[PDB]
Amino acid sequence: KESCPSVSIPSSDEHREKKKRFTVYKVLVSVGRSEWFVFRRYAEFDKLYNSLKKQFPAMALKIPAKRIFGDNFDPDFIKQRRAGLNEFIQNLVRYPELYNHPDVRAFLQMDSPRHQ
């Protein structure tokens, strides 16, 4: 019997570089007896969403807004975006045709040699 993946996004962190800031979400991915972390920015969730929404139109996949008229580093905005991204990924891993999908497996690092 294979284990169905379970995922959650418990936190995010702000990183900074020359005149640049970004938010990295910490995704906890668990497959049966083992678990690991994957670090992903919002754009990476959006790229997955845009691919899968075209491939599975009947699912009505939903991701939080991409554009915010206001401060995209407001902690309230980040906490809601994290909850929305968590809803998006948790919904995906409910379906084997999606968690066996190559783009989903790569996004969650499900076939990594470092997770052996």
Curated annotation (Swiss-Prot):
Domain PX: 3-115
Localization terms from the record: Cytoplasmic vesicle; Early endosome; Recycling endosome
Tissue: Widely expressed, predominantly in the heart, spleen and 7-day embryo.
Highest taxon listed in the record's lineage: Eukaryota
Function: Serine/threonine-protein kinase which is involved in the regulation of a wide variety of ion channels, membrane transporters, cell growth, proliferation, survival and migration.
Assembly and binders: Interacts with GSK3B and FLII. Interacts with PDPK1 in a phosphorylation-dependent manner.
Protein family according to the UniProt entry: Belongs to the protein kinase superfamily. AGC Ser/Thr protein kinase family.
The protein, known as: Serine/threonine-protein kinase Sgk3
Origin species: Mus musculus (Mouse)
Residues of the full protein shown: 10 to 125 of 496
